[PDB]
Write a protein that binds this ligand. Structure first.
Ligand code: WQ7
Length: 165
């Protein structure tokens, strides 16, 4: 199972790790992708997870979008986890760089409550433009299921742990 995580709360754990390497090692039941409404996995966590699946995640995602249309900001869908996990929960956090409502971050984290345990990144962090300290606070105050957060950036991981209230 998950190793080397720092316990933040009853159900939230955090580690300085590459979520792709973490997924290949643990092969969790659920890996969360930092998705956009189009499931276009170009960069950030989505681009990295997709590249690890040899683009199978993108092929599956394009078929999902062709059938269902785009997701809502704050919404999610469950697709295959390919070689990374049993399932991938594609969650759309607000992209503040695209001028999206930061209040939608709590709705985005609520999707995690449908899964008993997840390997996840901080939603709306990185290229999505939100403050990762705020994302961690929303995560701990919203998610009730067991969430193992992988933070790629060491300096950000240290800042998150050292400033955690
Ligand atoms: N080897 C994947 C590294 N990584 C982790 C998180 C987000 C983007 C990214 O490229």
């Amino acid at each position: 199972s998950f190793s080397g995580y720092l316990k933040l709360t009853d159900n939230v754990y955090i580690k300085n790790a590459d979520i792709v390497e973490e997924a290949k090692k643990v092969k969790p039941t659920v890996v969360v992708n930092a998705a956009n409404v189009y499931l276009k996995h170009g960069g950030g966590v989505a681009g990295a997870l997709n590249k690890a699946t040899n683009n199978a995640m993108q092929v599956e995602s394009d078929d999902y979008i062709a059938t269902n249309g785009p997701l809502k900001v704050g919404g999610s869908c469950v697709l295959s986890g390919h070689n990374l996990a049993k399932h991938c929960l594609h969650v759309v956090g607000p992209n503040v760089n695209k001028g999206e409502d930061i209040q939608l971050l709590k709705s985005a984290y609520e999707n995690f409550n449908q899964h008993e345990v997840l390997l996840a990144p901080l939603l709306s962090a990185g290229i999505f433009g939100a403050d990762p300290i705020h994302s961690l606070r929303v995560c701990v105050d919203t998610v009730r299921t067991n969430v193992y957060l992988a933070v790629f950036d060491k300096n950000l991981y240290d800042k998150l742990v050292s400033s955690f209230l």
